[PDB]
Ligand binder design. Structure first.
Ligand SMILES: CN(C)c1ccc(O)c2c1C[C@H]1C[C@H]3[C@H](N(C)C)C(O)=C(C(N)=O)C(=O)[C@@]3(O)C(O)=C1C2=O
Ligand SMILES: CN(C)c1ccc(O)c2c1C[C@H]1C[C@H]3[C@H](N(C)C)C(O)=C(C(N)=O)C(=O)[C@@]3(O)C(O)=C1C2=O
Ligand SMILES: [Mg+2]
Ligand SMILES: [Mg+2]
Lengths: 197, 197
């Protein structure tokens, strides 16, 4: 044990994959680290705090499109931002659940301010620009949550009208990705509309 | 004890409110009913099955706009359908989590077939019509999940750029409802677009 925040979060990320969000505990975490449970406090207070750092960490590694490139349309940006957010959530077991209920923190202030200012100078009012953000985040979270639940819920469970069958089979056969890429693009047309004003 | 499925689900709905989704168990349920745990099996196999019935029940009571009224635009219908779905999820503690990962069941076949056929005769292809449905459901679920988590997550936790502050305060001050009504309406403009074809 070199004893590191970075090693704790690494190890916690692994443990999340092993047991998932409900089964994750600080007790189980220290044991995986081969340390006593008081020691691990020097890095995490408790489960919520641990979960906040896991959520933060998943963005650090995977949410790469947190920032607009100039010349890149706001439209492409809401697109690539949602994509990498999605990508962040999917990176681990219960990724979307680990994010749920988190809020902006100090180290995101600059990223997030830039995010609203980028939209604003495109001509969205601050209000619509923050609603453009929540619509995309709510929608993306909704997709990954359903998509992520699908598997554990299919484990624990065991004939119809032909259009419904066709619809389910089309839905089932096409991944989460198209269902995701589709709504994403409906939201972007709503916003292309709104902005025209 | 008259011993009823209807009484079990009533009582389970109550228990969900008391302890929430993770703390709900069949063990805790029978004890609330004043019965032994074998007895309660004659109505529910296990937690997943219980959760499926709770999810079903919340739609029965509250998801009233499951069906289009002719003369009612598809647009008004996707609107009122999302609204009452939302309404279903919010009706109980962890309502949105209880739905997560559920799938269409036999008694929904007629409702749901009608739902895709209604859109189809409006001129959506089956595929887009099922994507119009998932976009709205994913988005609605994403809203209520975040909205529902907000409170428990605020219990268990403890300064910034002024536009971010303004954005948070605007966001915070305006309920979940506007953030919800907004994305909903972006999705509907995307679909008003797509259909034009
Ligand atoms: C293909 N078909 C669209 C599927 C496929 C997988 C699914 O997991 C689901 C659907 C239909 C949708 C219908 C949506 C609908 N609406 C968009 C809210 C809806 O009215 C209902 C309902 N029972 O009225 C659903 O079951 C629903 O909430 C739902 O849970 C679905 C759902 O779980
Ligand atoms: C007002 N502002 C938009 C708020 C308010 C409450 C919130 O709970 C949140 C935001 C910003 C959004 C930004 C979205 C952004 N995007 C739409 C995916 C985003 O890029 C980030 C990010 N850190 O890059 C978020 O924090 C974000 O995922 C997020 O978690 C937010 C979030 O949790
Ligand atoms: Mg967030
Ligand atoms: Mg569903």
């Amino acid at each position: 044990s070199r004893l590191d925040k970075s090693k704790v979060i690494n190890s916690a990320l692994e443990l999340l994959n092993e047991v998932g969000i409900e089964g994750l505990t600080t007790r189980k975490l220290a044991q995986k680290l081969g340390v006593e449970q008081p020691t691990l406090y020097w890095h995490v207070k408790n489960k919520r705090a641990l979960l906040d750092a896991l959520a933060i960490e998943m963005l650090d590694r995977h949410h790469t499109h947190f920032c607009p490139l100039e010349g890149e349309s706001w439209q492409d940006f809401l697109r690539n931002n949602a994509k990498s957010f999605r990508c962040a959530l999917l990176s681990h077991r219960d990724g979307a659940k680990v994010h749920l209920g988190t809020r902006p923190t100090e180290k995101q202030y600059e990223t997030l301010e830039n995010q609203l200012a980028f939209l604003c100078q495109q001509g969205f009012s601050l209000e619509n620009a923050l609603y453009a953000l929540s619509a995309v985040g709510h929608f993306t979270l909704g997709c990954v949550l359903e998509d992520q639940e699908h598997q554990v819920a299919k484990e624990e469970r065991e004939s119809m009208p032909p259009l419904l069958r066709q619809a389910i089979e089309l839905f089932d056969h096409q991944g989460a990705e198209p269902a995701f890429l589709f709504g994403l693009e409906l939201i972007i047309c709503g916003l292309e509309k709104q902005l025209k004003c």
